Amino acid sequence: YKEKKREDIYIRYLYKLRDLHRDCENYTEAAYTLLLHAELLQWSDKPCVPHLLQRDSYYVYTQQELKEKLYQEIISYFDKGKMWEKAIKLSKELAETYESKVFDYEGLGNLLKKRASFYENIIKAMRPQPEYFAVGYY
Amino acid sequence: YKEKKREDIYIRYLYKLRDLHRDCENYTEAAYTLLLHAELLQWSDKPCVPHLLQRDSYYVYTQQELKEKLYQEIISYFDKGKMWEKAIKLSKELAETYESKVFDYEGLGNLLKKRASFYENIIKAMRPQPEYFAVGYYGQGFPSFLRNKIFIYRGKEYERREDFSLRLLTQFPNAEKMTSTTPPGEDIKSSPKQYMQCFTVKPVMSLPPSYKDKPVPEQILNYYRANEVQQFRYSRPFRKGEKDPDNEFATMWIERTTYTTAYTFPGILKWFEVK
Amino acid sequence: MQAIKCVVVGDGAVAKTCLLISYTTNAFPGEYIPTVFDNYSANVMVDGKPVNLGLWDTAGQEDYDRLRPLSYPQTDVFLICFSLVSPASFENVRAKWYPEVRHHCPNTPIILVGTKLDLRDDKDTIEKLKEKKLTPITYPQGLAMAKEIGAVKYLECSALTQRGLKTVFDEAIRAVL
């Protein structure tokens, strides 16, 4: 579909895969997928296409707000996904958007509270290294 | 000394002034002074000159670490200085230095905890707007730097013009005021018997950059309303037209007097001459 | 953070509005700017905490006796005013202003306030009153009228000097406080 650029059904299958990963609790992969969706959006205020307006909830949803909801969810995933580097990375852009476009400093405070928790997690706890295998289909 | 660049004694007097402000609890001015010191340093690791190594404690102190201690203190001051915008500003650079050079994420966490507290304070509570008065020193008995000089004073949160006037009368003998408030007095430009005048001026609204159109809530602006300011206008009544009885506006012409000072309030000093 | 309601009445021949606006403007004496609206307000610190306030500039025409009392209810204090140099102003206050006000809001601390204190001892104004057969009526009888009502305070101030003016407003605020 990406090849064929028919993006709405593309998003539909994106959410399908997201459901799959949530079933498998592959929070990392789920976050990547959901991001890949959110990548389409812009921090612009006009919701330009209701194609991105999915069936989970359907009303105005400025591109900003939808992107914000997406980023919130993705950060949550990465958190319970035990992989905080990208979490902090994305928190940075989200805080930027808060400070420069919505100016809701309460969200700033909560977000940075979370980011501090992230840094604490990173320096404090340790994470096992996953083995990578090569598979030869013949 | 800044002119003469003999920087060590410069720092020594800096700390002197810092002591003064702490005695006066002018946390804002104290923070500005201490910053002005810390401005000299760099986030480099080599302590390049022990001149900056002051007498409070004297050992290795990489420029980084000293700068960090300074920033910690300054942030503390600004916090109890009830002026958090610069506090957050500096927290940003400090966190940057933490993440990029020391990687002590514990300090990151504490610092950002503080920053969140800052934002909460800013949005939540409200802060009184301090009145700013213009002071006109006239006469010749004034010291050299004072004679025929005009200053602007960042008064307290609700100082009435005459309260501050009397407080200045405390500061001075020959406590008299001329009445020609707006224009100067040529004789007293040269005459002895120091002459003074006080009057509130309008703190001309600053421009918060990149804010010019977004629906930013008032709190930001009311902070910017009086703090971080340099321009000051003063209105002037005048009759220009016929003095028709029922009407005053047939004559109303205003000779607003604008004032531009060297340094933007607040500063290291609670006042400044007009520039 | 709190605010205070405060009414000011009086004949239009004394221009109490000039006094009020001059005070709130913190302006230099004889340097105020007349606005287009009434009912000025300010936020003032008298003790402990700053407090907001607003001053109902009420026009003193006899006819607006229908609209003025509607402003009276739940006003923390009221300020009765006059001209120290107008015997007619005295007649109006003791005869019209004071009676009907005390009628309208019998339960509120009151301060009487003089005006044109500089003009009280103005010899030219005094001689004009004498040749017009009017009295530059002085303090002790103003004190007498204060006793007459038992007002919580009486004060005399001036606009061209703002003398006691700050004190006038401070007493007004601390009447509640």
DSSP symbols for A17-66 = HHHHHHHHT-HHHHHHHHHHHHHH--S-SS---TTSS-SSS-S---HHHH
Quick check: helix, strand or coil at residue C107?
Answer: coil
Could you tell me how many CB contacts below 8 A there are between chain A and chain B?
A: 49
How many Å apart are CA A108 and CA A113, to the nearest integer? 8
In our burial notation (b when 16+ CB lie closer than 10 A, e otherwise), range A77-109 reads bbbebeebebbbebbeebbebbeeebbbbebbb
Name residue A124's amino acid: K
Q: Cβ of C33 and B158 within 8 Å? A: no
Q: Which residue in B126, B161, B164, B202 has the most chain C C-beta atoms within 10 A of its own C-beta, making it the best mutation to test that interface? A: B161
- Please check whether residue C4 is in contact with residue C76, taking contact to mean a CB–CB distance below 8 angstroms: yes
Reduced to 3 states (helix: H, G, I; strand: E, B; else coil), residue B173 is coil
Quote the CA–CA distance of A111 and B4 in Å, as a whole number: 48
Residue type, B109: G
Identity at B96, one-letter amino acid code: E
What DSSP element (H or E) covers C168? Answer: helix C165-176
Q: Which of B129, B153, B160 should we substitute to test contact with C (largest number of C Cβ atoms within 10 Å)? A: B160
In contact, B234 and B134? CB cutoff 8 Å: yes
| Local structure of B132: helix, strand or coil | strand
Distance CA C104, CA B138 (A): 53
| Nearby residues of C40 by Cβ (< 8 Å), 6 or more positions away | C17, C20, C21, C24, C54, C55, C57
Inter-residue contact B34 to B73 (CB < 8 Å)? yes
Bond before B266 cis per omega within 30 degrees: yes
Q: In angstroms, how far is CA B170 from the centroid of its own chain?
A: 22
Q: Would the CB atoms of C33 and B237 count as touching at under 8 Å?
A: yes
Handedness of CA C34, C35, C39, C40 (dihedral sign): negative
Q: Where are the beta strands (DSSP E) in B102-206?
A: 132-137, 149-154, 198-200, 202-203
H/E stretch holding B258 reads strand B257-265
Q: Measured between alpha carbons, how far is A67 from A73 in angstroms, rounded to an integer? A: 10
- Cβ of residue A115 closer than 8 Å to a chain B Cβ: yes
B200: which DSSP letter?
Answer: E
C-alpha torsion B106→B107→B112→B115, nearest 10: 150
Helix (H, G, I), strand (E, B) or coil at C158: coil
Partner residue opposite B105 with nearest CB, options A100, A105, A122? A122
- Hey, are the CB atoms on C34 and B126 less than 8 Å from each other? no
Q: Verify whether the Cβ–Cβ distance B161 to C26 is below 8 Å.
A: yes
B199 closest CB neighbour out of C28, C34, C44: C28
Quote the CA–CA distance of B23 and B30 in Å, as a whole number. Answer: 10
Give residue A131's Cα distance to chain centre: 25
Residues in A closer than 8 angstroms to B105, CB to CB, are 119-120, 122-124
Q: In what order do the strands lie in the sheet with B202-203?
A: B202-203, B229-234, B257-265
Place of tokens 């905080």: A84
Q: What is the resolution of this structure in A?
A: 4.2
Task: Find out whether B70 and B37 touch, Cβ atoms under 8 Å.
Answer: yes
Closest by Cα among C152, C148, C149 to C168: C152
Output B139-143 pairs: Cβ under 8 A, ≥24 positions apart: B139/B174, B139/B188, B139/B191, B139/B192, B139/B193, B139/B194, B139/B195, B140/B188, B140/B190, B140/B191, B140/B192, B140/B193, B140/B194, B141/B174, B141/B192, B141/B193, B141/B194, B142/B194
Round to whole Å and give the CA distance between C29 and C166.
Answer: 13
Distance between CA atoms of C55 and C64, rounded to whole angstroms? 17
Q: How was this structure determined?
A: cryo-EM
**Interatomic CA distance for residues C136 and C139, integer angstroms:** 10
Which residues does chain B have within 8 Å of residue C34's beta carbon, measured at their own beta carbons? Answer: 248
In sequence order, what are the residues at sequence separation of 6 or more whose Cβ sits closer than 8 angstroms to the Cβ of residue A108? A95, A98, A99, B116, B119
Amino acid (1-letter code) at residue C88: A
| Residues B253, B237 contacting (CB under 8 angstroms) | no
Work out whether the CA dihedral A10, A16, A22, A25 comes out positive or negative.
negative
CA distances from C69 to B262, C3, C15, C62, C74 (A): 53, 21, 20, 12, 11
Helix and strand tally (H, E) in chain A?
5, 0
B204-212, long-range: CB within 8 Å, 24+ apart, which pairs? B204/B229, B204/B230, B204/B231, B204/B232, B204/B233, B204/B258, B205/B229, B206/B230, B206/B231, B210/A100
B254 contact residues in C (CB cutoff 8 A):
33
Judge: B214–A101 Cβ closer than 8 Å, yes or no.
Answer: yes
* Spatial distance between the Cα atoms of B225 and C156, rounded to a whole number of angstroms: 36
Sign of CA dihedral A58, A63, A64, A66: positive
Q: What are B269's two structure tokens?
A: 């000093």
Taking the C-alpha atoms of residue C92 and residue C64, their distance in angstroms, rounded to an integer, is: 15
A94 close to B91: Cβ distance less than 8 angstroms = no
Name the residue in chain B with its Cα closest to that of A105: B119
Return d(Cα B82, Cα B26) in angstroms, integer: 11
Element (H, E) at C69: helix C68-71
Sheet holding B198-200, edge to edge: B198-200, B132-137, B149-154, B271-273
Helices A63-80 and A84-97, packing angle to 10 deg: 160
Looking at the partner chain, which of C1, C27, C45 has a beta carbon nearest the beta carbon of B158?
C45
Helix (H) or strand (E) holding B11, with range, is helix B7-24
**Count of alpha carbons within 13 angstroms of residue B98, beta-carbon side:** 22
CA quadruple B242, B243, B245, B250: dihedral positive or negative?
Answer: positive
Q: B244-253, long-range: CB within 8 Å, 24+ apart, which pairs?
A: B248/C34, B252/C33
What backbone phi and psi angles, to 5 degrees, belong to B239? -95, 120
**Given the DSSP bridges, would you call strands C77-81 and C5-8 parallel, antiparallel or unpaired?**
parallel
Distance (Å, whole) CA A30 – CA A38: 12
Does residue A116 belong to the interface with chain B, where contact is any CB pair within 8 Å? yes
* Stretch 61-100 of chain A: residues touching chain B, C-beta under 8 Å: 100
Q: Phi/psi zone of residue B268: left (φ > 0), alpha (ψ -120 to 50 degrees), beta?
A: alpha
Q: Which of B271, B273, B258, B274 is nearest to B131 (CA)?
A: B271
What distance lies between CA B251 and its chain's CA centroid? 38
CA distance B274 to B234: 13
